[PDB]
């Protein structure tokens, strides 16, 4: 069992999997 | 799609690095594909050292048949009958009384699907502004309702090139609203703010990047043609956000190695993820100039004679607005980029 | 559709009268709607006395919101899901290196659905000719395979505006092939040629025009959204074809009174109709000049500054090609009109 | 019973009935 508790800043992106293109890319660090 | 996605991803990484230089701790949210699309349409009409600068910084010079590959990419992204909403649209707004080269217009229409709308920038730039904004608002399901604010276009504007991208997909594995609880989000080593933290435990593609002390998670959307990938440091272990080492070594090459499907394994994961919503605005002009795109924005040096046969135009601004709403059901994300072209 | 169809029909009658003046006995076959469409797109870019001449002769000046009404007409003609094939398509071919006004291009695209294709008239007019011809050939299901012959475009051509129309429908009431027999067709009072005469007896809308000694028949196609209307003198009673009195008094007004649905009654009719096929070619330039369209074709007088802001263009030729194949099953009909625009 | 025996020249046209527009217009007089 792994733990991914994203309660501190992270980088995220939405990838179009067939082409591997990044559609959106961000950092969430300030609620 | 090989060469084009590598190019687009290399630019995505360069532009994220530039934005991080101006703001190393705030939220950042962009659509790299939206920006690359607006610049690919501008690149069609550039010549000379203007073109050379754009293709180097955007990596278009590493792609054989760049515009044909984009045409194929647009066809795939906009395919009908998908189990999610995904729209990538391009459009040209030209001054009624202005003369454009046929080849420039035919190519933007064939390769990018951009049709030409004729507006009155010269006599009625406010009506023209509101027409552009209404179109982007319509493309983004209301999420980008005013891409261009007063003063972004005036009676000297000749062309505005616009890309809008919209996505709304359900998670493959949704979170249950009832498991969402208030929990503390640590901004840095000692500030805390309360967030709605969603929770579920499911098998997801996963990896711990041993040498970076970082976890990678992939959360598929319905259909599995798009995923969200999240990179999370093991803890905040620096004097700001915790991401400094990752951002330090973010390259096309490392991003690829960290998040490649081949490098993720299915694991049973406890996922705690905040429910969140971002709306961001960028004037990309200076960041792009810092990246090497210089003549394009310079009234005296810009060569856009591919658009009208003369060196009488230049790009005053490239602006980008974005939006993401992430919750238990899925994600709704939108962005739009406008390049405003004025008489030099 | 009221004002626009009246206008289009008035022009149809005027152009048939002009063609009849040049050839009072041969076969004539045109698509009036195709010609009106090509001229409506040209009219968008004309100004001055050039425009005034075009709108008077084409009756566009009798239609409020002419281009909007055509836009609606195109939408109806091209509606999907009909039980017959009917296509009306428009296209613009512009010299790669030439500059057109934005408003002209946006309007032809929005109102007429004409997209702009960029071709190399200046360096490669033969390739450009063959590209145009291939498109028309594709639109007409092969029935108009070479609209523009060698010499119709050269390295001075800047714009070619093209309309193609295609129709294939089954009869509502088909003829039985087995009832088709050789029979004599009387060309005039003493020449005869043998035709394949089709036969059936069915209830059709019908009328005998008492004072003209002429029969009118309507033969519906499947769906009854299109019909063929046939006007047949009671006998050959003049020294040529038998049609001289009808052609003499053919007006918008009389054509309407003779063939109006309200003026036809269902009758049980023995129909003998030849199986036939026509392919015709017209250079309409001089006929249109005779009709009052003069400055447009005149290098020194033509005002096409709506297309490029300057009086540097004129129309060298308007050519029309047509095709009809009428048999037991139905009718396949095709036509295409090209207006070639050269530097003055 | 009516008779429409088109064994001599005639004028014909194809009409779009909803709009009343003439799409094609001809005279058949020479087989
Ligand atoms: Ca909508
Ligand atoms: Ca076909």
XYZ file of C-alpha atoms and ligand atoms in Angstrom:
752
model
C 0.000 0.000 0.000
C 1.457 3.355 -1.038
C 0.628 6.784 0.290
C 0.266 9.874 -1.843
C -0.827 12.586 0.578
C -0.690 15.839 -1.382
C -0.880 18.227 1.601
C 2.049 20.354 0.462
C 2.954 21.892 -2.961
C 3.020 19.725 -6.101
C 3.416 20.004 -9.865
C 0.641 18.522 -12.075
C -0.143 18.263 -15.772
C -2.827 16.860 -18.023
C -1.311 14.684 -20.759
C -3.000 13.587 -24.017
C -1.821 9.970 -23.784
C -1.910 8.959 -27.518
C 0.325 11.872 -28.603
C 2.086 12.415 -25.265
C 1.377 16.154 -25.542
C 0.974 18.195 -22.338
C -2.275 20.098 -22.569
C -2.139 21.871 -19.161
C 0.710 22.231 -16.670
C 0.695 23.749 -13.222
C 1.989 24.022 -9.686
C -0.480 24.080 -6.796
C 1.266 25.742 -3.859
C -1.078 28.379 -2.394
C -4.605 27.448 -1.468
C 3.410 12.621 -33.141
C 6.916 11.782 -31.922
C 8.811 14.931 -32.988
C 6.016 17.413 -32.404
C 5.215 16.312 -28.841
C 8.884 16.380 -27.886
C 9.122 19.933 -29.267
C 5.942 21.079 -27.534
C 7.072 19.488 -24.244
C 10.536 21.082 -24.463
C 8.878 24.471 -24.907
C 6.432 23.675 -22.023
C 9.408 23.053 -19.741
C 11.222 26.242 -20.898
C 8.173 28.400 -20.371
C 7.464 26.882 -16.934
C 11.073 27.637 -15.951
C 10.684 31.293 -17.082
C 7.374 31.729 -15.152
C 8.999 30.165 -12.094
C 11.802 32.712 -12.320
C 9.255 35.488 -11.973
C 7.253 33.714 -9.240
C 8.958 30.913 -7.395
C 6.180 30.250 -4.834
C 2.770 31.167 -6.211
C 0.374 28.954 -8.135
C 1.213 28.582 -11.838
C -1.283 27.201 -14.408
C -0.856 27.307 -18.199
C -1.809 25.450 -21.319
C 1.498 24.961 -23.160
C -0.360 23.515 -26.235
C -2.536 26.574 -26.450
C 0.576 28.864 -26.458
C 2.471 26.681 -28.968
C -0.638 26.774 -31.245
C -0.926 30.556 -31.264
C 2.810 30.864 -31.948
C 2.664 28.187 -34.717
C 0.037 30.295 -36.521
C 2.144 33.450 -36.060
C 5.227 31.513 -37.293
C 3.436 30.789 -40.595
C 3.586 34.497 -41.408
C 7.035 35.352 -40.077
C 10.154 35.560 -42.191
C 13.787 36.357 -41.665
C 15.305 36.485 -38.221
C 11.869 36.907 -36.652
C 11.001 33.380 -37.943
C 14.309 31.976 -36.922
C 13.875 33.240 -33.393
C 10.332 31.835 -33.083
C 11.242 28.416 -34.468
C 14.297 28.073 -32.216
C 12.508 29.045 -28.984
C 9.369 27.023 -29.780
C 11.503 24.060 -31.104
C 9.535 24.114 -34.373
C 12.846 23.795 -36.104
C 13.218 20.284 -34.724
C 9.999 19.045 -36.392
C 9.794 17.918 -40.009
C 6.590 19.180 -41.595
C 5.663 21.074 -38.465
C 2.342 22.449 -39.668
C 1.201 19.094 -41.067
C 1.950 17.402 -37.819
C -0.090 20.069 -35.981
C -2.946 19.518 -38.424
C -2.890 15.807 -37.538
C -2.691 16.625 -33.799
C -5.728 18.938 -34.044
C -7.709 16.210 -35.830
C -6.976 13.720 -33.063
C -7.650 16.110 -30.156
C -10.955 17.217 -31.662
C -12.107 13.707 -32.766
C -15.841 13.198 -32.332
C -17.385 10.443 -30.184
C -14.969 10.537 -27.219
C -16.262 9.928 -23.634
C -14.921 13.375 -22.494
C -15.147 16.949 -23.874
C -11.918 18.143 -25.428
C -11.888 21.152 -27.905
C -8.873 22.946 -29.413
C -9.936 25.793 -31.695
C -8.112 28.551 -33.601
C -9.369 31.761 -35.125
C -8.142 34.888 -36.937
C -9.710 38.318 -36.533
C -8.579 40.765 -39.172
C -9.286 44.416 -39.712
C -12.065 44.698 -42.376
C -10.008 47.108 -44.546
C -6.693 45.301 -44.337
C -5.167 43.120 -47.063
C -3.654 39.780 -46.179
C -1.637 37.396 -48.356
C -3.727 34.502 -49.733
C -1.151 31.868 -48.868
C -1.024 32.935 -45.192
C -4.781 32.770 -44.822
C -5.146 29.436 -46.724
C -2.458 27.814 -44.614
C -3.827 28.916 -41.222
C -7.243 27.656 -42.331
C -5.993 24.278 -43.727
C -3.387 23.515 -41.076
C -4.978 25.010 -37.967
C -8.591 25.171 -38.820
C -8.554 28.897 -38.146
C -11.244 30.713 -40.057
C -10.961 34.451 -40.718
C -13.417 36.733 -39.014
C -13.478 40.302 -40.366
C -13.898 42.956 -37.634
C -13.757 46.712 -37.404
C -10.621 47.406 -35.362
C -10.156 50.791 -37.013
C -13.522 52.382 -36.262
C -14.913 50.165 -33.498
C -12.165 48.349 -31.556
C -14.431 47.837 -28.526
C -17.054 45.924 -30.517
C -14.231 43.936 -32.079
C -12.784 43.209 -28.575
C -16.152 42.053 -27.326
C -16.683 39.843 -30.362
C -13.334 38.114 -29.812
C -14.071 37.717 -26.058
C -17.517 36.295 -26.691
C -16.031 33.656 -29.036
C -13.411 32.556 -26.446
C -16.051 32.572 -23.725
C -18.178 30.252 -25.949
C -15.248 27.923 -26.668
C -14.321 27.647 -22.969
C -17.900 27.015 -21.677
C -17.749 30.371 -19.933
C -14.529 29.726 -18.145
C -12.488 32.459 -19.894
C -15.108 35.220 -20.235
C -12.784 38.174 -21.013
C -9.503 37.173 -22.634
C -8.730 40.731 -23.824
C -9.413 43.609 -21.490
C -9.930 47.272 -22.544
C -6.828 48.597 -24.176
C -5.603 45.238 -25.482
C -6.902 46.191 -28.992
C -7.184 49.658 -30.472
C -7.843 51.282 -33.841
C -4.336 50.362 -34.916
C -4.846 46.581 -34.439
C -4.823 44.696 -37.774
C -4.885 41.028 -36.725
C -5.587 39.020 -33.544
C -4.702 35.331 -33.642
C -6.607 33.290 -30.991
C -6.347 29.747 -29.671
C -8.820 28.363 -27.077
C -8.548 24.883 -25.471
C -11.245 23.280 -23.332
C -11.326 19.996 -21.390
C -13.890 18.370 -19.108
C -13.469 14.750 -18.189
C -14.648 12.469 -15.364
C -12.036 10.537 -13.428
C -11.749 6.897 -14.378
C -11.882 6.371 -10.545
C -13.951 9.148 -8.855
C -13.507 10.235 -5.266
C -16.523 9.878 -2.968
C -17.715 13.285 -1.795
C -18.489 11.781 1.581
C -14.823 10.949 2.221
C -13.738 14.547 1.669
C -12.584 16.181 4.901
C -10.958 19.432 5.970
C -7.257 18.962 6.340
C -4.173 21.197 6.561
C -2.170 22.111 3.509
C 1.396 23.069 4.261
C 2.556 25.926 1.973
C 6.113 25.724 3.339
C 7.812 24.594 6.549
C 5.515 26.633 8.853
C 2.490 28.207 7.131
C -0.665 26.121 6.927
C -4.050 26.623 5.334
C -7.083 24.349 5.527
C -8.189 22.591 2.320
C -10.957 20.138 1.394
C -8.885 16.989 1.083
C -10.407 14.210 -1.086
C -9.523 10.615 -0.353
C -9.632 7.220 -2.049
C -7.541 4.099 -2.174
C -7.311 2.413 -5.594
C -4.700 0.855 -7.919
C -3.065 3.626 -9.940
C 0.157 3.833 -12.031
C 2.744 4.929 -9.538
C 6.401 5.447 -8.817
C 8.723 6.755 -6.133
C 11.689 8.567 -7.742
C 14.313 7.249 -5.375
C 17.003 9.832 -6.067
C 14.705 12.846 -5.998
C 12.625 11.642 -3.021
C 9.481 12.306 -5.043
C 6.310 10.366 -5.798
C 4.628 10.262 -9.206
C 0.990 9.404 -9.621
C -1.153 9.040 -12.720
C -4.884 9.551 -12.429
C -6.639 8.426 -15.683
C -9.707 10.184 -16.962
C -12.584 8.206 -18.393
C -11.446 6.496 -21.600
C -7.802 6.698 -20.537
C -6.878 8.932 -23.514
C -5.950 11.719 -21.039
C -4.420 11.430 -17.564
C -3.406 13.833 -14.829
C 0.173 13.263 -13.683
C 1.203 14.621 -10.241
C 4.728 14.994 -8.912
C 4.894 15.290 -5.147
C 8.090 15.690 -3.044
C 8.287 13.268 -0.087
C 8.214 16.283 2.256
C 8.827 20.023 2.230
C 12.596 19.873 2.577
C 13.686 23.354 1.576
C 12.998 26.865 2.729
C 9.992 27.378 0.444
C 7.403 25.054 -1.228
C 9.333 21.739 -1.172
C 9.577 21.672 -5.011
C 12.907 23.479 -5.415
C 15.026 20.439 -6.274
C 12.444 19.108 -8.802
C 12.070 22.522 -10.475
C 15.831 22.822 -10.466
C 16.211 19.665 -12.526
C 13.070 19.803 -14.615
C 14.109 19.054 -18.225
C 12.277 17.524 -21.155
C 14.487 14.511 -20.604
C 13.853 14.101 -16.856
C 10.128 14.840 -17.094
C 9.960 12.047 -19.680
C 11.863 9.589 -17.532
C 9.799 10.370 -14.416
C 6.331 10.091 -15.985
C 6.681 7.682 -18.965
C 3.973 4.910 -18.751
C 6.833 2.415 -19.004
C 8.310 3.842 -15.793
C 5.112 3.671 -13.740
C 3.810 0.523 -12.084
C 0.318 -0.266 -10.806
C 0.209 0.124 -7.026
C -2.516 0.243 -4.438
C -2.361 3.880 -3.390
C -3.961 5.965 -0.676
C -4.616 9.257 -2.508
C -5.241 12.462 -0.602
C -5.669 15.325 -3.051
C -7.096 18.798 -2.426
C -10.203 19.938 -4.181
C -9.006 23.189 -5.903
C -9.687 25.852 -8.497
C -7.173 28.220 -10.217
C -7.691 31.103 -12.586
C -4.477 32.688 -13.805
C -3.542 35.516 -16.231
C -0.197 36.060 -17.911
C 1.277 38.627 -20.172
C 3.733 36.334 -21.867
C 5.412 39.019 -24.013
C 8.470 39.632 -21.778
C 8.860 35.967 -20.809
C 8.927 35.030 -24.491
C 11.423 37.847 -25.174
C 13.585 36.439 -22.367
C 13.307 33.046 -24.081
C 14.742 34.487 -27.295
C 11.684 35.764 -29.137
C 12.838 39.311 -29.650
C 12.318 40.798 -33.134
C 8.687 39.673 -33.211
C 7.708 42.198 -30.511
C 10.008 44.937 -31.816
C 8.244 47.499 -34.021
C 11.407 48.139 -36.066
C 12.794 44.648 -36.419
C 9.703 42.373 -36.811
C 9.366 40.569 -40.103
C 5.748 39.496 -40.589
C 5.798 39.943 -44.360
C 4.423 36.402 -44.690
C 1.085 37.875 -43.572
C 0.793 40.916 -45.853
C 3.938 40.984 -47.996
C 5.440 43.982 -46.168
C 7.342 44.588 -42.959
C 4.556 46.845 -41.618
C 3.239 44.634 -38.784
C 4.574 43.538 -35.367
C 3.174 41.670 -32.338
C 2.501 43.991 -29.428
C 1.380 41.368 -26.863
C 0.854 37.681 -26.300
C -1.503 37.099 -23.427
C -2.597 33.791 -21.823
C -5.523 33.117 -19.440
C -6.250 29.742 -17.777
C -8.680 27.970 -15.464
C -8.845 24.613 -13.726
C -11.440 23.183 -11.386
C -10.449 19.851 -9.870
C -12.936 17.948 -7.683
C -14.356 14.501 -6.843
C -15.946 13.866 -10.254
C -13.085 15.001 -12.496
C -11.482 18.161 -13.890
C -12.698 21.035 -16.012
C -9.721 22.984 -17.509
C -9.711 25.859 -20.006
C -7.162 28.259 -21.512
C -6.871 30.792 -24.341
C -3.924 32.693 -25.921
C -4.206 35.847 -28.058
C -1.389 37.408 -30.112
C -2.230 41.003 -31.025
C -0.689 42.342 -34.250
C -0.458 46.059 -34.772
C 0.914 48.358 -37.464
C 4.611 49.036 -36.814
C -37.025 32.906 -50.275
C -39.676 35.028 -51.992
C -37.539 37.931 -53.275
C -34.415 35.944 -54.050
C -36.135 33.260 -56.145
C -38.015 35.878 -58.142
C -34.704 37.654 -58.828
C -32.898 34.445 -59.761
C -35.795 33.382 -62.022
C -35.928 36.789 -63.743
C -32.217 36.482 -64.495
C -32.733 32.832 -65.654
C -35.312 34.049 -68.167
C -33.076 36.940 -69.369
C -30.092 34.685 -69.858
C -32.161 32.033 -71.677
C -33.450 34.763 -74.012
C -29.854 35.918 -74.748
C -28.648 32.324 -75.453
C -31.668 31.796 -77.699
C -30.709 34.895 -79.664
C -27.373 33.305 -80.471
C -28.854 29.850 -81.175
C -32.548 29.663 -81.861
C -32.701 25.927 -82.715
C -29.976 23.981 -80.938
C -30.139 22.353 -77.523
C -29.621 24.761 -74.611
C -28.836 23.576 -71.045
C -27.706 25.805 -68.161
C -27.824 26.055 -64.417
C -29.102 29.590 -63.757
C -28.489 29.166 -59.958
C -24.899 28.231 -60.566
C -24.363 31.418 -62.684
C -26.213 33.667 -60.199
C -24.018 32.202 -57.390
C -20.724 32.933 -59.122
C -21.902 36.466 -59.929
C -23.176 37.011 -56.332
C -19.665 36.231 -55.043
C -18.112 38.570 -57.636
C -20.698 41.253 -56.693
C -19.439 41.180 -53.082
C -16.143 42.645 -54.276
C -17.389 45.096 -56.890
C -17.913 48.784 -56.288
C -19.028 51.768 -58.280
C -20.711 51.391 -61.628
C -19.343 47.864 -61.992
C -21.487 46.870 -58.947
C -24.459 48.779 -60.164
C -24.354 47.020 -63.502
C -24.058 43.551 -61.920
C -26.868 44.116 -59.427
C -29.241 45.485 -62.077
C -28.683 42.664 -64.592
C -28.722 39.914 -61.944
C -31.715 41.588 -60.120
C -29.737 41.548 -56.856
C -30.911 45.076 -56.371
C -34.458 43.822 -55.901
C -33.524 41.629 -52.902
C -33.202 42.932 -49.353
C -30.213 41.347 -47.642
C -29.235 39.531 -50.802
C -26.223 37.692 -49.419
C -28.066 36.565 -46.281
C -30.865 35.179 -48.335
C -28.328 33.259 -50.462
C -26.730 31.921 -47.287
C -30.144 30.592 -46.217
C -30.760 29.147 -49.712
C -27.402 27.317 -49.655
C -28.223 25.837 -46.235
C -31.527 24.468 -47.506
C -30.173 23.098 -50.808
C -27.295 21.352 -49.054
C -29.359 20.033 -46.076
C -28.269 16.572 -44.969
C -30.583 13.535 -44.870
C -32.537 14.135 -48.105
C -33.635 11.154 -50.297
C -31.719 12.597 -53.334
C -28.185 13.989 -53.881
C -28.115 17.748 -54.249
C -24.811 19.744 -53.714
C -24.159 23.455 -54.342
C -20.569 24.402 -53.532
C -18.456 27.556 -53.921
C -14.721 28.064 -53.840
C -12.065 30.768 -54.290
C -8.635 30.134 -55.779
C -6.236 32.987 -55.196
C -2.697 33.587 -56.306
C -0.365 32.634 -53.382
C 1.440 36.023 -53.462
C -1.607 38.231 -53.826
C -3.222 40.278 -51.048
C -6.970 40.262 -50.630
C -9.152 42.401 -48.358
C -10.196 40.588 -45.154
C -13.819 41.649 -45.409
C -14.177 40.237 -48.951
C -12.768 36.876 -47.953
C -14.776 36.648 -44.669
C -18.008 37.454 -46.463
C -17.579 34.939 -49.306
C -16.758 32.304 -46.686
C -19.683 33.168 -44.315
C -22.335 33.862 -46.938
C -21.388 31.399 -49.671
C -19.375 28.836 -47.887
C -16.496 29.487 -50.259
C -13.166 28.632 -48.721
C -9.955 30.141 -50.096
C -7.511 27.841 -51.793
C -4.063 29.355 -52.414
C -2.545 28.350 -55.785
C 0.456 29.313 -57.846
C -1.016 31.115 -60.857
C 2.141 33.169 -61.317
C 4.719 30.396 -61.609
C 2.588 27.323 -62.321
C -0.778 28.213 -63.903
C -1.183 24.714 -65.377
C -0.973 23.004 -61.980
C -3.380 25.617 -60.660
C -5.766 24.936 -63.617
C -5.643 21.220 -62.976
C -6.269 21.691 -59.265
C -9.377 23.781 -59.956
C -10.600 21.237 -62.568
C -10.055 18.304 -60.245
C -12.159 20.016 -57.541
C -15.079 20.664 -59.955
C -14.777 17.138 -61.314
C -15.052 15.853 -57.692
C -18.064 18.058 -56.924
C -19.905 16.962 -60.091
C -19.265 13.181 -59.671
C -17.093 13.313 -62.768
C -19.639 14.969 -64.948
C -17.694 18.221 -65.521
C -14.115 16.901 -65.739
C -12.425 19.973 -67.300
C -14.190 23.249 -66.562
C -11.174 25.380 -67.579
C -9.222 24.405 -70.652
C -5.591 25.419 -71.413
C -5.330 29.143 -71.740
C -8.257 29.948 -69.442
C -5.747 30.813 -66.638
C -2.244 32.180 -67.034
C 0.498 33.683 -64.879
C -1.478 36.903 -64.696
C -4.566 35.282 -63.077
C -5.069 36.445 -59.462
C -8.448 34.948 -58.507
C -10.845 32.302 -59.882
C -14.288 32.151 -58.293
C -16.009 28.749 -58.833
C -19.513 27.422 -58.263
C -20.414 23.740 -58.891
C -23.963 22.300 -58.588
C -24.801 18.597 -58.668
C -28.138 16.749 -58.618
C -29.100 13.081 -58.846
C -32.610 12.064 -57.966
C -34.909 9.124 -58.764
C -38.309 9.872 -60.241
C -41.170 9.648 -57.792
C -42.794 7.536 -60.601
C -40.104 5.692 -62.653
C -40.556 4.592 -66.237
C -40.262 0.863 -66.949
C -37.267 0.163 -69.173
C -39.275 -2.510 -70.928
C -41.804 0.029 -72.231
C -39.099 2.121 -73.887
C -39.293 1.928 -77.678
C -37.645 3.593 -80.654
C -39.798 6.387 -81.926
C -39.370 9.425 -84.193
C -38.504 12.817 -82.812
C -39.529 15.674 -85.045
C -36.914 18.484 -84.956
C -39.103 20.741 -87.118
C -41.841 20.310 -89.723
C -39.866 17.788 -91.840
C -36.651 16.499 -90.229
C -36.929 13.431 -88.025
C -34.492 11.506 -85.879
C -35.111 8.299 -83.945
C -35.049 8.488 -80.129
C -35.571 6.002 -77.287
C -39.020 7.083 -76.173
C -39.964 6.160 -72.568
C -43.598 5.626 -71.699
C -45.836 5.497 -68.636
C -49.332 6.511 -67.693
C -49.733 7.939 -64.173
C -51.439 10.856 -62.375
C -49.192 13.911 -62.615
C -49.770 17.674 -62.064
C -50.811 18.901 -65.458
C -52.233 21.738 -67.481
C -53.040 22.705 -71.048
C -52.319 26.428 -71.587
C -55.351 27.132 -73.716
C -54.161 30.374 -75.284
C -50.646 29.188 -76.063
C -51.696 25.694 -77.216
C -49.091 24.220 -74.880
C -49.062 21.444 -72.295
C -47.298 21.671 -68.935
C -46.267 18.615 -67.001
C -44.615 18.241 -63.615
C -42.629 15.110 -62.890
C -41.735 14.942 -59.134
C -38.491 13.449 -57.958
C -38.404 11.237 -54.901
C -39.298 13.315 -51.837
C -41.089 15.894 -53.979
C -38.668 18.683 -52.952
C -37.552 18.964 -56.617
C -39.599 18.477 -59.791
C -38.928 18.604 -63.507
C -41.362 20.892 -65.321
C -41.800 20.423 -69.107
C -43.483 22.816 -71.510
C -44.530 21.197 -74.761
C -46.294 22.946 -77.698
C -49.365 21.054 -78.981
C -47.573 20.620 -82.326
C -44.711 22.097 -84.324
C -46.620 25.039 -85.754
C -43.870 27.323 -86.991
C -41.005 27.081 -89.412
C -38.502 25.812 -86.834
C -38.754 23.871 -83.506
C -42.398 24.613 -82.564
C -41.318 26.668 -79.496
C -41.153 30.107 -81.128
C -44.354 31.523 -79.639
C -43.502 30.257 -76.104
C -39.941 31.628 -76.287
C -41.361 34.843 -77.660
C -43.499 35.359 -74.575
C -41.314 33.786 -71.930
C -41.230 36.222 -68.974
C -40.746 35.728 -65.258
C -44.423 36.539 -64.956
C -45.700 34.081 -67.590
C -43.353 31.272 -66.549
C -44.773 31.680 -63.037
C -48.367 31.599 -64.200
C -47.810 28.556 -66.438
C -45.997 26.350 -63.906
C -47.199 27.481 -60.429
C -48.384 24.408 -58.375
C -51.655 26.286 -57.883
C -52.158 26.320 -61.661
C -51.549 22.606 -62.206
C -54.139 19.910 -61.594
C -53.664 16.169 -61.115
C -54.516 14.337 -64.335
C -54.047 10.830 -65.609
C -51.417 11.376 -68.279
C -49.845 9.248 -70.977
C -46.210 10.430 -70.881
C -43.873 9.796 -73.785
C -40.496 11.359 -73.053
C -37.164 10.746 -74.788
C -34.265 9.294 -72.912
C -31.521 11.961 -73.486
C -28.153 13.332 -72.458
C -26.731 16.873 -73.031
C -23.324 18.327 -72.345
C -23.029 22.010 -73.169
C -20.295 24.691 -72.882
C -20.778 28.443 -72.869
C -18.554 31.428 -72.762
C -21.009 33.722 -71.067
C -18.814 36.854 -71.178
C -20.382 38.477 -74.282
C -23.931 37.398 -73.409
C -23.551 39.008 -69.988
C -22.082 42.143 -71.615
C -25.127 42.225 -73.907
C -27.283 41.963 -70.775
C -25.674 45.094 -69.335
C -22.654 43.760 -67.471
C -20.035 45.878 -69.156
C -17.432 47.517 -66.886
C -16.737 44.234 -65.098
C -15.069 42.745 -68.200
C -13.377 45.998 -69.220
C -9.738 46.250 -68.108
C -9.943 50.051 -67.785
C -13.360 50.494 -66.249
C -13.764 47.523 -63.822
C -14.054 48.384 -60.164
C -13.190 45.325 -58.075
C -11.615 47.317 -55.250
C -13.858 45.427 -52.813
C -11.509 42.468 -53.354
C -8.099 44.109 -52.890
C -8.742 47.797 -52.204
C -7.495 48.925 -55.634
C -8.873 49.107 -59.148
C -6.186 46.700 -60.432
C -8.369 43.658 -61.226
C -10.984 42.830 -63.897
C -12.907 39.711 -64.990
C -11.613 38.322 -68.263
C -14.139 35.470 -68.703
C -17.169 33.818 -67.194
C -17.542 30.301 -68.477
C -20.341 27.764 -67.813
C -20.380 23.987 -68.468
C -23.417 21.712 -67.939
C -24.569 18.104 -68.164
C -27.865 16.266 -67.887
C -28.668 12.594 -68.247
C -32.384 11.837 -68.176
C -33.580 8.209 -68.217
C -36.104 5.736 -66.759
C -34.823 5.907 -63.168
C -34.416 9.677 -62.830
C -32.035 12.500 -63.758
C -28.406 13.248 -63.042
C -27.612 16.961 -63.741
C -24.404 18.916 -63.118
C -23.040 22.390 -63.891
C -20.136 24.656 -62.924
C -19.341 28.371 -63.524
C -15.888 29.978 -63.235
C -15.167 33.729 -63.242
C -11.494 34.387 -63.979
C -10.013 37.585 -62.515
C -6.840 38.977 -63.975
C -4.654 42.020 -63.356
C -5.938 44.966 -65.412
C -56.805 10.711 -69.906
C -54.311 13.288 -71.169
C -51.509 12.821 -73.647
C -48.074 14.343 -73.304
C -46.109 12.941 -76.233
C -42.816 14.838 -76.271
C -41.703 13.835 -79.792
C -40.856 17.378 -80.854
C -38.862 20.193 -79.119
C -39.683 21.224 -75.538
C -38.405 23.458 -72.750
C -37.697 21.839 -69.336
C -36.367 22.917 -65.957
C -35.619 21.414 -62.578
C -37.223 23.458 -59.791
C -36.334 23.353 -56.067
C -39.954 23.304 -54.878
C -39.549 24.791 -51.328
C -37.754 27.927 -52.590
C -39.163 27.913 -56.134
C -35.636 28.407 -57.499
C -34.790 27.029 -60.961
C -31.684 24.911 -60.646
C -31.368 23.818 -64.317
C -33.138 25.077 -67.437
C -32.981 23.772 -70.968
C -34.474 23.202 -74.388
C -34.267 19.747 -75.960
C -34.605 20.198 -79.717
C -31.837 18.198 -81.430
C -31.352 14.563 -80.583
Ca -21.371 25.166 -25.263
Ca -18.109 11.556 -54.736
